[PDB]
Short mmCIF file of C-alpha atoms and ligand atoms in Angstrom, two decimals:
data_model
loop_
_atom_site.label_atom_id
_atom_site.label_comp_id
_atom_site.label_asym_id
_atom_site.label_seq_id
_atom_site.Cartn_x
_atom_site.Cartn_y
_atom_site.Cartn_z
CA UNK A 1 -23.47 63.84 12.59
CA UNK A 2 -25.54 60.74 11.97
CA UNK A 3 -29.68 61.01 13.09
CA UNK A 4 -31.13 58.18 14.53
CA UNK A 5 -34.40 57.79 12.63
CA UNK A 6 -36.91 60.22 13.90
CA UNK A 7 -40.50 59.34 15.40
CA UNK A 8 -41.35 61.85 17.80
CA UNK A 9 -44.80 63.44 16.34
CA UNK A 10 -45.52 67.30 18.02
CA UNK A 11 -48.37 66.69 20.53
CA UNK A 12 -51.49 68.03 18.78
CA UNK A 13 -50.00 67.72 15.16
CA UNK A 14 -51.11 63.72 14.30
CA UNK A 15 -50.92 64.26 10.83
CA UNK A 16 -47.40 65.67 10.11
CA UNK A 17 -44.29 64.17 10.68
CA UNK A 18 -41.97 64.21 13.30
CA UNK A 19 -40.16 68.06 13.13
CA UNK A 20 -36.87 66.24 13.20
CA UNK A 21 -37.83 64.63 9.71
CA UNK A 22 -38.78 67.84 7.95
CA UNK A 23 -35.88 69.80 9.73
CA UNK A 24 -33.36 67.60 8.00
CA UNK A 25 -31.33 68.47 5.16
CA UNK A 26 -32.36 66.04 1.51
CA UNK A 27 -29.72 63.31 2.33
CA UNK A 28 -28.41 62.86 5.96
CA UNK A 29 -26.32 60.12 7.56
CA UNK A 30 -28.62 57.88 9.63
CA UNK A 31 -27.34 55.30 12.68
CA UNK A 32 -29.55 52.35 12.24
CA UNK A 33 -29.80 50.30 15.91
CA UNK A 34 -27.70 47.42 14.50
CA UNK A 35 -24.91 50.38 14.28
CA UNK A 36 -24.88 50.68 10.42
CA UNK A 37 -23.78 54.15 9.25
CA UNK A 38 -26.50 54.83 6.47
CA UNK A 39 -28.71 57.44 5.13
CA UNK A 40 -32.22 59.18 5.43
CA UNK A 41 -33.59 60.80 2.38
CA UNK A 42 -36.29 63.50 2.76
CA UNK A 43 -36.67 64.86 -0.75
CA UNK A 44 -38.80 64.14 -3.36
CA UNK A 45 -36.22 64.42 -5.95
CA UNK A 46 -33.77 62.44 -4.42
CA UNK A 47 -36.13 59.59 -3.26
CA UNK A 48 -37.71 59.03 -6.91
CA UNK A 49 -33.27 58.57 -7.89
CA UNK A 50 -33.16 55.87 -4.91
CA UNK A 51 -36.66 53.74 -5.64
CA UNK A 52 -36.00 53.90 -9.76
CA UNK A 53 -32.13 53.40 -10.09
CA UNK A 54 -31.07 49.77 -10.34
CA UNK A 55 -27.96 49.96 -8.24
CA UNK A 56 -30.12 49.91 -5.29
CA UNK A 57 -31.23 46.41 -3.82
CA UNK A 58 -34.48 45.25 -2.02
CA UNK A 59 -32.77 42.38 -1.16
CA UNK A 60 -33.10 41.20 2.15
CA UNK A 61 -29.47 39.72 3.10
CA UNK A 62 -27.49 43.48 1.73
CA UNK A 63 -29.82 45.53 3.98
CA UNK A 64 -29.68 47.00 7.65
CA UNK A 65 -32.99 46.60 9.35
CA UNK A 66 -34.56 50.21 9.91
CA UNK A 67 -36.04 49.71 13.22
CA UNK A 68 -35.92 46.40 15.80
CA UNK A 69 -31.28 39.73 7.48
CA UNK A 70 -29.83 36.53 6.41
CA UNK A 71 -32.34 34.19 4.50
CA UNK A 72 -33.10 34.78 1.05
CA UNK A 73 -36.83 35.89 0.21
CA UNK A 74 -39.19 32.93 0.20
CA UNK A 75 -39.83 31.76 -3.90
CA UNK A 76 -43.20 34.35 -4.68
CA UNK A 77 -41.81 36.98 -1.87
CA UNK A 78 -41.32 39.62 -4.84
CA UNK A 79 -41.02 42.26 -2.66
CA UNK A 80 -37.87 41.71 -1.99
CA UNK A 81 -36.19 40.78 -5.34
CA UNK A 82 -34.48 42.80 -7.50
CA UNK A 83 -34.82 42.41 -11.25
CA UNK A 84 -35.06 39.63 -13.37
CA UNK A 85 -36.06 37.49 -10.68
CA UNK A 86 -38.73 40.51 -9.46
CA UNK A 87 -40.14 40.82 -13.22
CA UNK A 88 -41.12 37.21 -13.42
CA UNK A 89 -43.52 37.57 -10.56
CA UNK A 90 -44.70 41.54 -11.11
CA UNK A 91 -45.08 40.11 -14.69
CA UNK A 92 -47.77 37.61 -14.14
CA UNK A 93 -49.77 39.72 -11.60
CA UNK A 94 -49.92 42.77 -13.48
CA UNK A 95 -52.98 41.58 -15.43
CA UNK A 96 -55.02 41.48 -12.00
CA UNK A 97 -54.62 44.82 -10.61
CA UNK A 98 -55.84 46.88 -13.98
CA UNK A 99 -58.65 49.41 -13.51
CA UNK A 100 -60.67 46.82 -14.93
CA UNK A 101 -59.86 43.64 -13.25
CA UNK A 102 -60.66 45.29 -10.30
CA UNK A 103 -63.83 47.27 -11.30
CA UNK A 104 -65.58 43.75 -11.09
CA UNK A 105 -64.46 43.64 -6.97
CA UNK A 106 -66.14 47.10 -6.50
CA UNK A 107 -69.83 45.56 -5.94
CA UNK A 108 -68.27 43.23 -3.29
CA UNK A 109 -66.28 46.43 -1.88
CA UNK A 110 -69.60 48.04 -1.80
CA UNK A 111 -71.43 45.57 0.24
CA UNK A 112 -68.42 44.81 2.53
CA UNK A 113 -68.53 48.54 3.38
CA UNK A 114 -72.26 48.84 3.92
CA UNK A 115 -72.89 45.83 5.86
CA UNK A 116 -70.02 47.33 8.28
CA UNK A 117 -72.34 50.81 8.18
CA UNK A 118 -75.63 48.54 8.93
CA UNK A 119 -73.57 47.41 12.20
CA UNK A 120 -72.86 50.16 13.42
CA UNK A 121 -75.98 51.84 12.70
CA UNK A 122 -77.45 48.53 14.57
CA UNK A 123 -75.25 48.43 17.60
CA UNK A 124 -75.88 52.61 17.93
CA UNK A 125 -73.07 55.05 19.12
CA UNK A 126 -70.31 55.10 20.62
CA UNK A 127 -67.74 52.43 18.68
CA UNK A 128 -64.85 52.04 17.79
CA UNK A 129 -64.05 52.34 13.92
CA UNK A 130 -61.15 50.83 14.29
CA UNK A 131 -62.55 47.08 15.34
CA UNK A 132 -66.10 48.07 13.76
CA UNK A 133 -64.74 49.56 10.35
CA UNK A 134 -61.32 49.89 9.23
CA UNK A 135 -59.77 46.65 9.97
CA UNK A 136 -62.68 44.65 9.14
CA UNK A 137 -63.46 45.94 5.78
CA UNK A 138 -60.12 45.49 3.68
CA UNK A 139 -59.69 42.32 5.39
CA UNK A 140 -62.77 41.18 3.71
CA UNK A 141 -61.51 42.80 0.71
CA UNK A 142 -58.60 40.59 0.64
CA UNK A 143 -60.45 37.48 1.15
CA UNK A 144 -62.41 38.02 -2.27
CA UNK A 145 -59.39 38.73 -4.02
CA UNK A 146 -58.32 35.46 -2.39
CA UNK A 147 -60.99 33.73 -3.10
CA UNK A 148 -61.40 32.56 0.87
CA UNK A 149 -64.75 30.62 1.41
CA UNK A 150 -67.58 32.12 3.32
CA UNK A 151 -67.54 29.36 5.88
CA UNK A 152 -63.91 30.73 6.25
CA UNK A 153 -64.51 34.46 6.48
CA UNK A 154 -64.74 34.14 10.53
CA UNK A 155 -61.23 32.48 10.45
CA UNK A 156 -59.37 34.94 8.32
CA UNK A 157 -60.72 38.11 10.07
CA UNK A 158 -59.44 36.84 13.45
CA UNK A 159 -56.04 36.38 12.58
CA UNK A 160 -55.72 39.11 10.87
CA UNK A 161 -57.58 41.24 13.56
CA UNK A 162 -55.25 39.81 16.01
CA UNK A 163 -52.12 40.85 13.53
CA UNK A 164 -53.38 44.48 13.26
CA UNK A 165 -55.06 45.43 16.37
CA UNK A 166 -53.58 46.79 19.69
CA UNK A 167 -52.30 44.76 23.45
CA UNK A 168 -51.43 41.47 21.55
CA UNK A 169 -48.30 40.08 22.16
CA UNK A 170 -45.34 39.48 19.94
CA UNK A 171 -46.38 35.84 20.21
CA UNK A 172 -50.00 36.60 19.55
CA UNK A 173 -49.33 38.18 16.29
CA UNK A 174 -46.28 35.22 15.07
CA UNK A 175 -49.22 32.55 16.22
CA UNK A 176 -51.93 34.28 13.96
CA UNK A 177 -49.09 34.91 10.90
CA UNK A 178 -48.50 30.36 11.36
CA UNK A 179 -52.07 30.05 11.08
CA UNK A 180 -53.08 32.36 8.67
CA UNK A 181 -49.76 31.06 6.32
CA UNK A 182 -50.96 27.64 7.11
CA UNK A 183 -54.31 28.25 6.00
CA UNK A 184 -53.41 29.92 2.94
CA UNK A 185 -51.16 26.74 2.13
CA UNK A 186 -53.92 24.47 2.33
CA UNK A 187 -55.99 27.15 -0.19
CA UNK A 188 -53.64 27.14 -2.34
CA UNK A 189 -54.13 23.42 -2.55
CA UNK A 190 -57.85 23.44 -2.78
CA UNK A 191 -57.80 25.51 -5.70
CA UNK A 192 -54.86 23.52 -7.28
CA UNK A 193 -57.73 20.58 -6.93
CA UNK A 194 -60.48 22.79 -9.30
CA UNK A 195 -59.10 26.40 -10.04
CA UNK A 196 -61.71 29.22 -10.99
CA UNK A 197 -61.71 32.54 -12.04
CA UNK A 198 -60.70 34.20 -8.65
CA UNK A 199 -57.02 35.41 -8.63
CA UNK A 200 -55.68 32.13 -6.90
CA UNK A 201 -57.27 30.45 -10.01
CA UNK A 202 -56.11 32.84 -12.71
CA UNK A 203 -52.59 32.05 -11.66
CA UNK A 204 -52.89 28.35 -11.34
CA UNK A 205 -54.38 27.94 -14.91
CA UNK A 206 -52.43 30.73 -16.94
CA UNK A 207 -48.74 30.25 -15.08
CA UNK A 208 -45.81 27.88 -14.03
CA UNK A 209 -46.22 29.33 -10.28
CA UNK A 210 -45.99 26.26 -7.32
CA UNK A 211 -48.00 26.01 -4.34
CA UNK A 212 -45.25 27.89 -2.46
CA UNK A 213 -44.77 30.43 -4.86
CA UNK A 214 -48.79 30.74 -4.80
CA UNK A 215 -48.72 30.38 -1.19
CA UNK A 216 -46.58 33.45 -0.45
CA UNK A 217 -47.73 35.61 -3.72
CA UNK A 218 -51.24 35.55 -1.62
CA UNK A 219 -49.57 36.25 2.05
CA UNK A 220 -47.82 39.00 0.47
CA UNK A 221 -51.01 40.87 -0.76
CA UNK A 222 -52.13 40.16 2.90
CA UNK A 223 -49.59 41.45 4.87
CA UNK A 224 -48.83 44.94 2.34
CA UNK A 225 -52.85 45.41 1.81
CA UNK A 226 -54.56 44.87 5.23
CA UNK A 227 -52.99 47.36 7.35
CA UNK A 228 -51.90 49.67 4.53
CA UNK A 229 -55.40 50.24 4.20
CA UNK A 230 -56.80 49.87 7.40
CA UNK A 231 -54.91 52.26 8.42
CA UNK A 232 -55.73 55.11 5.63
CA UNK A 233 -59.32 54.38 6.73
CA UNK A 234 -59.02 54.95 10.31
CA UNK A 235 -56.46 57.95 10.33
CA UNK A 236 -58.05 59.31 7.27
CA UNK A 237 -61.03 59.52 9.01
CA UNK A 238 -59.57 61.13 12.36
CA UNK A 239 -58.37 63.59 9.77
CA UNK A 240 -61.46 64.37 8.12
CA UNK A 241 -63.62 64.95 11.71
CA UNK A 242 -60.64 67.22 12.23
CA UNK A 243 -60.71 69.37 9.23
CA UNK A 244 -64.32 69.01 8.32
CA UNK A 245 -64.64 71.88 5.95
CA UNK A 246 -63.09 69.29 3.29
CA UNK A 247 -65.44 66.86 3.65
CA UNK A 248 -67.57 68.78 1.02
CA UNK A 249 -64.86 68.21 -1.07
CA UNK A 250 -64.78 64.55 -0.40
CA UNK A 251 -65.89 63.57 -4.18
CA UNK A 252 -62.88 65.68 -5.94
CA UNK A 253 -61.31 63.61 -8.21
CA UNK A 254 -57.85 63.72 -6.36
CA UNK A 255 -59.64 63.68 -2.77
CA UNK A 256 -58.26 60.11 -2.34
CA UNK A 257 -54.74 61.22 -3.43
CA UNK A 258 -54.65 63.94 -1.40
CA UNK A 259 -55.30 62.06 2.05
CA UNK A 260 -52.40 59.74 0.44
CA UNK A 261 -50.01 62.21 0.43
CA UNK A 262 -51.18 64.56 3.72
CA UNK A 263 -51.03 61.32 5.72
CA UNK A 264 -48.46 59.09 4.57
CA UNK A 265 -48.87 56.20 6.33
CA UNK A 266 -46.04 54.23 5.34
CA UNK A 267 -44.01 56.44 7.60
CA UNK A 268 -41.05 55.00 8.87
CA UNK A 269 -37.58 54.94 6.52
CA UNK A 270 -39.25 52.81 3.75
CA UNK A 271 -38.77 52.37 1.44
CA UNK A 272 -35.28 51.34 2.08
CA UNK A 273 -32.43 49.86 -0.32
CA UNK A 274 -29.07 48.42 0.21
CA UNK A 275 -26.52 50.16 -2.39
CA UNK A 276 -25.14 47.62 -4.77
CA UNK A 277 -22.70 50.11 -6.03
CA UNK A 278 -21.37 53.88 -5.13
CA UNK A 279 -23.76 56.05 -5.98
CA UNK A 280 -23.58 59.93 -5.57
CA UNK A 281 -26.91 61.51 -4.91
CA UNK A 282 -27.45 65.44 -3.97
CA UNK A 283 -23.46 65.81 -3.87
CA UNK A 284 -23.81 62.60 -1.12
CA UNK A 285 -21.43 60.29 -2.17
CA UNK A 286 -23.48 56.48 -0.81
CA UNK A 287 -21.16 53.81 -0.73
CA UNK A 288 -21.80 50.05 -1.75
CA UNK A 289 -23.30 48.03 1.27
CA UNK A 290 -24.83 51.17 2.44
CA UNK A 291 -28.64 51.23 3.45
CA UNK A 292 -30.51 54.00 2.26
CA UNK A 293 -33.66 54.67 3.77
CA UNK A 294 -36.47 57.68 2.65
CA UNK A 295 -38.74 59.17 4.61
CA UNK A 296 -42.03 59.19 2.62
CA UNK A 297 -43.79 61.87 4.95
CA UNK A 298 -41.47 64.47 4.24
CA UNK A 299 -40.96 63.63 0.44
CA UNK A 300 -44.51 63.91 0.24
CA UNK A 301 -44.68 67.42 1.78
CA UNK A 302 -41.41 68.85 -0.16
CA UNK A 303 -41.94 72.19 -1.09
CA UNK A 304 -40.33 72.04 -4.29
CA UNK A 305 -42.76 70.07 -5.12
CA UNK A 306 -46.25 70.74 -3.54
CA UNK A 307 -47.76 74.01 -2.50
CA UNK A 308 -48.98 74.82 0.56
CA UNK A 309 -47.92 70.95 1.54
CA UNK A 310 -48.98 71.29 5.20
CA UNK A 311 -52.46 71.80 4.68
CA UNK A 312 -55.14 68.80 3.91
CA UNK A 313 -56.68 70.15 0.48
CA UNK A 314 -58.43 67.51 -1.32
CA UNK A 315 -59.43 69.52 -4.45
CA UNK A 316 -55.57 71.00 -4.21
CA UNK A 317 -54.56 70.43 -7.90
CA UNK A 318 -51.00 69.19 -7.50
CA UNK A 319 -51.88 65.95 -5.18
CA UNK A 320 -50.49 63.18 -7.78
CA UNK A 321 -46.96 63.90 -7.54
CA UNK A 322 -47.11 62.33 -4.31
CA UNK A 323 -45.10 58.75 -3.44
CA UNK A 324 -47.26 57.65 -0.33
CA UNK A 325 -47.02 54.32 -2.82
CA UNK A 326 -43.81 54.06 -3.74
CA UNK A 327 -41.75 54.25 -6.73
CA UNK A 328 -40.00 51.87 -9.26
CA UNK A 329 -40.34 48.47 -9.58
CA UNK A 330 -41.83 47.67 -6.64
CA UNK A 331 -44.41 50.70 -6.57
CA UNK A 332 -47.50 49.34 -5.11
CA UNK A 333 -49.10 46.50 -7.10
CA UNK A 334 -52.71 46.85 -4.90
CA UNK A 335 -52.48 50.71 -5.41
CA UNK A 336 -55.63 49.93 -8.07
CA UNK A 337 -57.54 48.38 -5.43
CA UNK A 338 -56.16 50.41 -2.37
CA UNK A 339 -57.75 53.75 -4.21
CA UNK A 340 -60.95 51.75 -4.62
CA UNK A 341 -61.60 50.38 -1.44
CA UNK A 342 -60.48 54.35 -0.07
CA UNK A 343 -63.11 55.98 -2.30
CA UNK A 344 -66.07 53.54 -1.43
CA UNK A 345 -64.94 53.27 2.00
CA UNK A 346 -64.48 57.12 3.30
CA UNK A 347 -67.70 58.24 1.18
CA UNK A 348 -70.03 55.12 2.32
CA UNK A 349 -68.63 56.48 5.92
CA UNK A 350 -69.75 60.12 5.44
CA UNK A 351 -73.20 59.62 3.38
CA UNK A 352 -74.49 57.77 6.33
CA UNK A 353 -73.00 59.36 9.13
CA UNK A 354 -72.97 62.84 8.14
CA UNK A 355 -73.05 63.92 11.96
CA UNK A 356 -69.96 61.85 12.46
CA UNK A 357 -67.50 63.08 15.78
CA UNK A 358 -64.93 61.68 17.90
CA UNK A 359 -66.45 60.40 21.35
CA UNK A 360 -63.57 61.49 22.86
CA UNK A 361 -61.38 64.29 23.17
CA UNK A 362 -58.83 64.25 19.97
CA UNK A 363 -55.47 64.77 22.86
CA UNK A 364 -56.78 60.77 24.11
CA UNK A 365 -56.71 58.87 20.00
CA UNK A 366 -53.51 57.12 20.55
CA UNK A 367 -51.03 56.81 17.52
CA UNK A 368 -49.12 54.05 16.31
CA UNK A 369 -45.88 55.54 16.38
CA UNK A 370 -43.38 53.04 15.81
CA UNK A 371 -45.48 50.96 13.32
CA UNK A 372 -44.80 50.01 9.72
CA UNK A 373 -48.27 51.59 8.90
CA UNK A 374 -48.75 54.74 11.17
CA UNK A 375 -52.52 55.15 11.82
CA UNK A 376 -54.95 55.19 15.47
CA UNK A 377 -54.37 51.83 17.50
CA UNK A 378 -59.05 52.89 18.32
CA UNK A 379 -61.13 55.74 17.22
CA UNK A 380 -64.05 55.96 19.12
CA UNK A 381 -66.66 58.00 17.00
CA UNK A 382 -70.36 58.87 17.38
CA UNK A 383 -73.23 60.28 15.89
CA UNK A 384 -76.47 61.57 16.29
C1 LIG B 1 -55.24 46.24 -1.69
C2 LIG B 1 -54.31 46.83 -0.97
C3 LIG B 1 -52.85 46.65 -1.36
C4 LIG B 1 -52.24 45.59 -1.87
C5 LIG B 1 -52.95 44.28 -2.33
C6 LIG B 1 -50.81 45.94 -1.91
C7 LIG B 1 -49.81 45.16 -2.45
C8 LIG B 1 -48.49 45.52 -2.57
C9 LIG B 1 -47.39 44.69 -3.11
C10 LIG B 1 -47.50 43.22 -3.58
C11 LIG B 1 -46.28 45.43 -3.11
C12 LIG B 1 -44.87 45.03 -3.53
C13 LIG B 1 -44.79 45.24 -5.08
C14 LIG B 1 -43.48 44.77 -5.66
O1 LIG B 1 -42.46 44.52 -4.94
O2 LIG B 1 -43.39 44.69 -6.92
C15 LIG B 1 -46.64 46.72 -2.58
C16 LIG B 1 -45.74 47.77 -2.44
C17 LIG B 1 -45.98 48.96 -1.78
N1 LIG B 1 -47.21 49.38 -1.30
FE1 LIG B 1 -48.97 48.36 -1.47
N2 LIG B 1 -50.63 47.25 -1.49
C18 LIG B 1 -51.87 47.68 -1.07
C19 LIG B 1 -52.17 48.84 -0.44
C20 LIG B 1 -51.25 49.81 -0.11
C21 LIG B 1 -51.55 51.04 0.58
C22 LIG B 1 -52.92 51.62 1.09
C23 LIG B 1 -50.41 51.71 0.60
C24 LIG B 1 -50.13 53.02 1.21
C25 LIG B 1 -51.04 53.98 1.39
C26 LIG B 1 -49.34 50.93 0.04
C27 LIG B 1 -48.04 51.34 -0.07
C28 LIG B 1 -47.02 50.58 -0.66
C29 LIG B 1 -45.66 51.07 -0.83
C30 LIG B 1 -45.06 52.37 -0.28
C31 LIG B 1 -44.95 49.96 -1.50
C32 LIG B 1 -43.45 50.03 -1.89
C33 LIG B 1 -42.59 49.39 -0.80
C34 LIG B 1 -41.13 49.41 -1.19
O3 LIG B 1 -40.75 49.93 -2.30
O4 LIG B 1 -40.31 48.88 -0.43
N3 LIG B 1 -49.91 49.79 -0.47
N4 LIG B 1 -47.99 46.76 -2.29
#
């Protein structure tokens, strides 16, 4: 009988997901709330056959919207291509998103992250890491891979705040997504003027792109890097003051993978992919026009695949066959950068808070349940 797509967490149990995810056999028929008949798909091995095999669209027009479709994507929206017209774009960023390209980021990352610290230190305890910390810093991030002014910095944080952060409207968050597009338009322009060596510039100098192309490129690494990360920050932190005896283990190499896969953030039946063609999977038989949706938290505790894959053990030596990023084409482009900012972000935290605690009981952190990116909508912390 078809599931509607679970997202009831067990009270006490932030971390994990929702029993009726987990309880669910590897491929199960799903209702989607338009009344599509699709599918859920919970294990690992399955999942990797949906994100890698080609007869499976991320176009937006063959697709069933997973929770709350005509138009196709905006010229740069890559996400949501399929191949050739994806490779074009993935092609030309590639280059940007090394190891290396973003190694020369990390002393901005660094100074981002301790002039947040410095605040708080400054303002003295109790805040909230959400506004003081985790949205802040990758939004800051962002705007130096953007190349944003400083005069500017102000400008972009608000919207973006107002995009990510708990009680604003509907309407707040559209207004703030006009501005913020606007905005980048008009950098796009700037930098058309008298490119540099920034990303923005790069691609203006080396490529064929248009301002609109340009224009959405940059939205798009705002919109699947702010909260993505924001949100590993702030939960991954809750997690941490909750199991404290790893954060000794906090510098293992795979500590950052680890709190990837434990917390899977992008939670909610994505990635998702319209079926171009029949395809059987597990003895499923998925028809064409079928959505197919996976549910990353489970996938990333499969225990085919990962031992012990309830418990948070960040020097547990099977952490990288995870997916908390994806798969296939469109595995995550900023996953260079997302790592990077995680590292420097979580161990800044701890080095100069090491009394770090929740200022409130852990039952009152509420949970963004029904978000793209699960995380803490506040996390009030202290310290001594
Ligand atoms: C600097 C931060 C990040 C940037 C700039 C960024 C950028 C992007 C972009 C452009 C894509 C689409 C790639 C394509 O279609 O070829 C993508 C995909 C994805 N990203 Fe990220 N990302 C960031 C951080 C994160 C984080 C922290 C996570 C999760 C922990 C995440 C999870 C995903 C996943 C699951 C996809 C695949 C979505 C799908 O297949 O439908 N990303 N990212």
């Amino acid at each position: 009988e078809p599931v509607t797509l679970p997202t009831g967490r067990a009270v006490g149990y932030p971390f994990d997901p929702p029993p009726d995810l987990v309880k669910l056999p590897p491929v199960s028929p799903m209702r989607f709330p338009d009344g599509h008949i699709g599918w859920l798909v919970t294990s690992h091995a399955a999942a990797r056959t949906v994100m890698i095999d080609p007869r499976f669209s991320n176009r937006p027009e063959h697709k069933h919207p997973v929770f709350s479709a005509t138009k196709a994507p905006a010229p740069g929206w890559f996400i949501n291509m399929d191949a050739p017209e994806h490779t074009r774009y993935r092609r030309m960023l590639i280059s940007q998103f090394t190891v290396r390209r973003i190694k020369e980021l990390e002393p901005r990352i660094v100074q981002i992250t301790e002039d947040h610290l410095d605040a708080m230190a400054k303002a003295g305890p109790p805040v909230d890491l959400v506004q003081a910390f985790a949205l802040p810093v990758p939004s800051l991030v962002i705007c130096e891979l953007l190349g944003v002014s400083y005069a500017d910095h102000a400008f972009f944080q608000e919207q973006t705040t107002i995009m990510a952060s708990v009680d604003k409207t509907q309407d707040e968050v559209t207004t703030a997504l006009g501005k913020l597009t606007r905005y980048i338009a008009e950098l796009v322009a700037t930098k058309r003027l008298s490119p540099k060596d920034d990303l923005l510039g790069s691609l203006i100098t080396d490529t064929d792109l248009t301002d609109e192309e340009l224009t959405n490129i940059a939205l798009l690494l705002l919109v699947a890097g702010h909260e993505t990360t924001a949100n590993m920050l702030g939960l991954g932190t809750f997690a941490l003051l909750q199991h404290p005896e790893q954060i000794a283990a906090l510098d293992s190499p795979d500590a950052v993978e680890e709190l990837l896969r434990y917390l899977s953030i992008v939670h909610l039946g994505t990635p998702n992919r319209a079926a171009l063609e029949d395809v059987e999977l597990e003895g499923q038989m998925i028809r064409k026009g079928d959505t197919v949706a996976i549910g990353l938290p489970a996938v990333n505790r499969d225990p085919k695949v990962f031992d012990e894959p309830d418990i948070l053990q960040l020097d547990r030596v099977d952490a990288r066959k995870h997916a908390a990023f994806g798969g296939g084409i469109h595995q995550c482009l900023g996953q260079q950068l997302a790592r990077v900012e995680m590292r420097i972000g979580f161990t800044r935290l701890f080095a100069r808070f090491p009394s770090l605690r929740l200022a409130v009981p852990a039952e009152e952190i509420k949970l963004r349940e029904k978000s793209a990116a699960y995380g803490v909508w506040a996390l009030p912390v202290a310290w001594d």
